[PDB]
Amino acid sequence: HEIGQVPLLTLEEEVELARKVEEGMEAIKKLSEITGLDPDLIREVVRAKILGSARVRHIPGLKETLDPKTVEEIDQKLKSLPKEH
Amino acid sequence: LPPGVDALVKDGEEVVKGQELAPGVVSRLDGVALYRFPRRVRVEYVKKERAGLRLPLAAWVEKEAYKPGEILAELPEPYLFRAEEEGVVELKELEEGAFLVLRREDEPVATYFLPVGMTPLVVHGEIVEKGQPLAEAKGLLRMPRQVRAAQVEAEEEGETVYLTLFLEWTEPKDYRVQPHMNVVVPEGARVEAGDKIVAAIDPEEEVIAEAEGVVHLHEPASILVV
């Protein structure tokens, strides 16, 4: 049903999206650094939230990441960071 | 949106069922208009300055209760006088104007404007500084309605009152946004001398702000409603 998919990725669109990703990572880098926290860690976070909660692995490898607790902790932190950051 | 098609981006304020979008674009699916992919964007740059003139001397021919879009001098047989400071003629444009720049040398040597009524002979006006520009002040010499004005400085000594006042006007413009470009600026946001507006891959020749610029976007690739 990948036809229900909108492969309407005109060049202009593909493009746009592209940069929007790199930048996204570059950011993560700043972050981790501007935080002393692991980058992978970060994006891992970034995901869950964007990946919605109806999708959170009920078993993050069985408690690996405290999907419901250690998570927000980070959020309010980042959120509690200056605009620039 | 086809190319050049666009109607309600400055109305991304709201959207309704069957909301009219583009000649051939509809919107039953309610919500709010959203900007998507620009291509064309106007840029008005406010332009202010000062000028020195020569009008009806020993007579009142202008009242303060006047603004942008009225008369100046009127039916004086015949205004054709001798000025005495030339340069490099350069006539500017208006919806009703031809202003003269006098680049004698590199410096701003002289400033002269001619509202509807005064005929600006281009390069004619420079040999032995005789007010050679034989402009003809006759009748209703009105002013373009596009630029406000005030603070007149009339000086009585002979035939024509040398005036000086405030010249405030805006001036629309436009530029294309290619697929790789990106507006940094939002909804008609203000712009300054050194404030980069839009960019793209080529650091070379990308949207560079200037003297008081304002935002207006006109050519999207699409629109979102939600």
Write B11-14 long-range contacts (CB < 8 A, 24+). B12/B187
Q: Does A12 touch chain B (CB under 8 A)?
A: yes
Which of B:23-52 have CB within 8 Å of A?
37
Give the sheet arrangement for strand B216-217, strand by strand: B174-176, B40-42, B216-217
A14 touches chain B (CB under 8 A): no
Q: Is B180 on the interface with A (CB under 8 A)?
A: yes
Q: Which of B31, B35, B28, B44 is nearest to B6 (CA)?
A: B35
DSSP structure string for chain B? --TT----GGGTT-B-TT---BTTB---S-B-EEE----EEE--B-EEEEEE--EETTS----SS--TTS--S---TTB-----------EEE-SSBEEEE--SSSS---EE--BTT----SS-S-SSSS------B-S-----TTEE--------SSSEE--EEEEEE----EEE--TT-EE---TT--B-TT-B-EE-S-SSS--B--TTB--EE---S-EEE-
CA distance B83 to B110: 10
Chain B neighbors of A10, CB-CB under 8 A: 221
Residues B30 and B220: beta-carbon distance below 8 Å: no
Buried b (16+ CB within 10 A) or exposed e, B165-194: bebebeeeeeeebebbbbbebeeeeebeee
**Burial of A59 from C-beta contacts in 10 A (0-12 / 13-18 / 19+):** exposed
Nearest-CA residue of chain A relative to B178?
Answer: A12
CB B162 within 8 A of CB B91: no
Q: Which residues contact B6 (CB under 8 A, 6 or more apart)?
A: B22, B218, B219, B220
List the binding residues of A for Mg(2+): 64, 80
- A19: distance to nearest CA of chain B, Å? 10
**Under a CB-based contact definition with an 8 Å cutoff, are residues B153 and B95 in contact?**
no
What CA–CA distance (Å, rounded) separates B177 from B201? Answer: 12
Q: Terminus-to-terminus CA distance in chain A, angstroms?
A: 41
Deposited experimental method: X-ray
Tell me, yes or no, if A15 comes closer than 8 A to chain B by beta carbon: yes
Resolution value, angstrom units: 3.0
**Which among B43, B170, B146, B28 is positioned nearest to B95, based on CA atoms?**
B146
The answer to whether the Cα torsion of B111, B112, B115, B116 is positive or negative is: negative
With an 8 Å Cβ cutoff, are A15 and B179 in contact? yes
Chain B residues touching residue A15 (CB < 8 angstroms): 179-180
